Design a protein around this ligand. Structure first.
Ligand SMILES: [Zn+2]
Ligand SMILES: [Zn+2]
Ligand SMILES: [Zn+2]
Length: 110
């Protein structure tokens, strides 16, 4: 074994994403197509009728007392609310550059 080389095998999807397996990429392709006019943008469900969806949406319904500051996202749970916001800011701070002047970079003479 002197040496070896290789890349990475994956499976592209209609949307553009790439999965490790074909079955994982396929399921994402069939879902893309239009199945029902009503779709639950909370869990990932769907219903033919509008009333058929409501009887299910009642499982997600609920006021969001906790909301982010950067993305202003809404979260019903506390642990998740803070758990997310905590990071959501981490990055924001980096950009804040409250007192971080962007000084040009050093060139290269070769
Ligand atoms: Zn896809
Ligand atoms: Zn749902
Ligand atoms: Zn956020």
């Amino acid at each position: 074994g002197s040496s070896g080389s290789s890349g990475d095998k994956l499976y592209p999807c209609q949307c553009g994403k790439s999965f490790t397996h074909k079955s994982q990429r396929d399921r994402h392709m069939s879902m893309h197509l239009g199945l029902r006019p009503y779709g639950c943008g909370v869990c990932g469900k769907k219903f033919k009728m509008k009333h058929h969806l409501v009887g299910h949406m009642k499982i997600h319904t609920g006021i969001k007392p906790y909301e982010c500051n950067i993305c202003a996202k809404r979260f019903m749970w506390r642990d998740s609310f803070h758990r997310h916001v905590t990071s959501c800011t981490k990055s924001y701070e980096a950009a804040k550059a409250e007192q971080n002047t962007t000084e040009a970079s050093g060139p290269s003479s070769g």
